[model samples]
Target: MNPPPPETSNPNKPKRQTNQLQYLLRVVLKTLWKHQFAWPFQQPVDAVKLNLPDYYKIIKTPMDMGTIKKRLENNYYWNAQECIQDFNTMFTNCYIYNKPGDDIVLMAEALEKLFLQKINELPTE
Candidate 1:
């Protein structure tokens, strides 16, 4: 006899169940989303218009607050650390592309500071 038909679901991986952690993660994300200096980070950078050819190459996975929000809404992130990794990527990219004291760089710094301050307050249970 032939092998059993494959199941539609992936037995190896479990479902992404939402809980208090995701709820709190969303709270942090919304805080960052509503920041005063979050305008520039709302979407992906315009490398073509900005004339930075190396931007894509340097920052392999370009991340932004908008994308992070969408990912959160879609439950793309498995945990808080995964979400924070994206936020770090967004800020690190800015640090790489923009020189010191640049306004964009400053905004990134401010946002990261806010992110950390908020993230630390999450319940560890």
Candidate 2:
């Protein structure tokens, strides 16, 4: 018997909205950064340290830097690998779920490397 005709389409299931996928990389990056730095709440004190550059791309709105400073002062530790892992997970999730096209992929990769390099430059304590 001829293989079943390729599933042509799903009438009831709506097409995945393309716009929803757009900027998904940015969203994931922001989520990961937020979680990574949310110490004394979602994250542990020894989770990792976050710097300004890490927020440069992820933070879209104006923020009170003082709040960040206070948070760091309250919960400070060093775990570069955790930061790197968070970044990697963000990228992997974006790729698998969002399926961003080439441009986003490149930007995501670049941002990951940039953050990693910044983390590397920090003085280990």
Candidate 3:
């Protein structure tokens, strides 16, 4: 006599619940991507073109929205914490690289607050 089939027979389900968090994070990322100030942060900073050779020297961990989106596309983030850290670094680097009163700095601050608000609104369950 044979027993019932194993529950793991279906390959659609993953063992970890991280996918839910990733899905929600993707939504948050898209929100940031569509923001008015997102244009400046869509790609890597052009140090040579912008004539700021010191950009890299100060921003040790440069990040951008497009790169973060690609990371989600490539499954580069293991958990929400990792993704959140990168977002925070993106804003922090912007602040350090730009002048205190720069428009980009103000935009970055606004976007940073938006990100925090969205992140806080995520369901913890």
Candidate 4:
């Protein structure tokens, strides 16, 4: 296959004007949640460099063929009930409820939903 084009330094261009503390947090969530984190055409994708907010940047089903292939390859979320079960497993794995009782039970659950939302938002084609 052919290699990508040479770098276009465009050094005169301005830097990002939208940096935010929340962006970093969202990246933490994404890095924890996204399955295709370092997906095996991932150029447009980088887990650490998040420009996202409280939402994931979903790729459409009929397009972004790479995403579609990744989804069907994993049987993670088969349905809502199954997804909830996976969330529970996630909670346990992250030690959310392993501390007998703590402040993160609901936090884990909430992030689990966000995690599943990210998986569901991926293309199902």
Who wins the TM-score comparison?
3
Please state every model's RMSD to the true fold in angstroms: 9.2, 20.4, 12.7, 17.4
The local distance difference test score of each candidate is 0.72, 0.36, 0.73, 0.34
Prediction 4 TM-score vs. true: 0.25
Looking at model 3, the pairs that clash are: none
- Arrange candidates by TM-score, descending: 3, 1, 2, 4
RMSD of 2: 20.4
- Candidate 2: what lDDT? 0.36
TM-score attained by model 2: 0.33
Clashing pairs in 2: none
lDDT of 3 by residue, 1-125 (tens): 12232122234533233653565456788888889988888877877778787877776777877777776665666577777887888899898877888999989988988888888866554
Score candidate 4 by lDDT.
0.34
Score every model by TM-score: 0.77, 0.33, 0.79, 0.25
What C-alpha lDDT, on a 0 to 100 scale, does residue 124 get in candidate 1? 54
TM-score, model 1 to reference: 0.77
State the local distance difference test value for candidate 3.
0.73
Higher-lDDT candidate among 2 and 4?
A: 2
Candidate 3: regions farther than 4 A off: 1-20
Kindly list the per-residue Cα lDDT of model 4 for residues 1-125, writing each as its tens digit.
12232222234543231222122224423354344432322222232354333112232111111332232223222333432343344345435212534444444555556555554533222
Model 2 lowest lDDT segment of ten:
39-48
lDDT of 2 at 32: 32
